[PDB]
Amino acid sequence: PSDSEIPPLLVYKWTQGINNLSEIWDVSRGQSAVLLETTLGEMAEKIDFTLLNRLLRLIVDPNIADYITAKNNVVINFKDMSHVNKYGLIRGLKFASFIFQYYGLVIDLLLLGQERATDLAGPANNPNEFMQFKSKEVEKAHPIRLYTRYLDRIYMLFHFEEDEGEELTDEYLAENPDPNFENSIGYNNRKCWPKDSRMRLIRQDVNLGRAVFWEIQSRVPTSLTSIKWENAFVSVYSKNNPNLLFSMCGFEVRILPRQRMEEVVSNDEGVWDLVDERTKQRTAKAYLKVSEEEIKKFDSRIRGILMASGSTTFTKVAAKWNTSLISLFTYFREAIVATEPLLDILVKGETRIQNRVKLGLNSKMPTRFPPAVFYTPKELGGLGMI
């Protein structure tokens, strides 16, 4: 995260960027854009203090760096058990954010490459804005068009021609080869969408995505971070799949233009209209859902705030669940209207409190227990539920 864009603004600005790339949606000649999302697993746990320490000696006075690694080496204690952390970063430290993001810059430089990362950052004197390039030529130079990293999660947007895709697929099928077409097995597309929305599986696009991911995994060392296919989501926009699927900061984003729009049905409520800067018209649209992980996190917090945690009082439960659901509706906002499954978890969970408040009053089931007690400002004595 930067100090400017909140994660939602990172999602919106990101989609606007993909839409603002030059002729990214044209598959006519065989162009295939591949957006690879993957989380870097175990990274902060496998960070090494010697390498990390030298990389810090690059940034800062080695006194500060030796303080940092010296602080990352301490005795970690839990109840009646003690050890030392020799291997891996201690996140609870305050500078652990700077260390985390910088080591993430090491892995970024490995992913992008010296020349290409130089192309994204532009001149050091006049650093370009996020997803802004000095020229369409350097935009079209390397297969990587857009790149960004949110914590462990990394987002790499590729644009290939027919010859490029055929080359990488021929290479990864040269080292790989599996004539049984098992490449469709183990592939995990985001499953929270409605069928056709989810990207279809076609051997050329699947082998394209797995080929790119294999190039990336082979590009980044193993002893640094573990990049796993089951942790990686690879979306492929091509002549086949007119859906660009990526999960950023909890938002489930599918992107479809006006070009191929006729392939599927519009989602009506809860949508974004992506506008190009050059044409000054609406080029694409991005339909959104809430990710299954964020849904499991909300249902998680409800079951934990009610079924797991009892006793206490009423106004405290209504206030805690209240601020929880306010937090979620403020972070997701419009996507809640679009996502069907969570709108049920809302009613179910919101009913769990009324049951929790009723069954706190008495053992019997109230036939009709008036909503006016739950919904009423706390100033009047009500629970203040929203």
């Binding site: 006793s311 069954l359 706190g360 053992s363």
Partner: protein, 142 residues
């Protein structure tokens, strides 16, 4: 259990054990002692016994050799827990519906200490029935 917790042999050990102690709070239990439900309550009442020693006290009573108090206190059950203070039955209000005895297991040591403390409070205040701080409505109500 069956180490720290004294096991009352017969109905005379039960009766006498109840009558002797004026100061402490007599906690009697009854269970088949081979049953999982009463076994858990035993292995809880060992540590609970060590904590509540100074005021309450715990006594193991199986129903094998003693059929006497079943006809009196209406005990069949997988297990039961009886309380007595000044040789008087201490009625304990849970959300189970049975105020006399508790047939349900509790999983929290600090909780069990809390309800023993509570019935000890009402006991000294001489109240026949004391309201347990917790509910146990939906928990067991067996």
């Amino acid at each position: 259990a069956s180490v720290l917790l004294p096991q009352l042999r017969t109905g005379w050990h039960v009766d006498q054990a109840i009558v002797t102690e004026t100061k402490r709070l007599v906690v009697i239990r009854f269970g088949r002692k081979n049953d999982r439900q009463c076994m858990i309550m035993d292995e809880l009442l060992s540590s609970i016994a060590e904590r509540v020693r100074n005021f309450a006290v715990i006594y193991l009573c199986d129903i094998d050799e003693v059929s006497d108090f079943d006809e009196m206190y209406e005990l069949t059950d997988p297990m039961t827990v009886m309380f007595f203070y000044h040789n008087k039955h201490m009625m304990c209000d849970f959300g189970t519906g049975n105020n006399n005895k508790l047939n349900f297991i509790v999983d929290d040591k600090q909780e069990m200490i809390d309800i023993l403390e509570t019935i000890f409070r009402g006991a000294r205040k001489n109240k026949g029935l004391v309201v347990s701080p917790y509910d146990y409505n939906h928990k067991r109500v067996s």
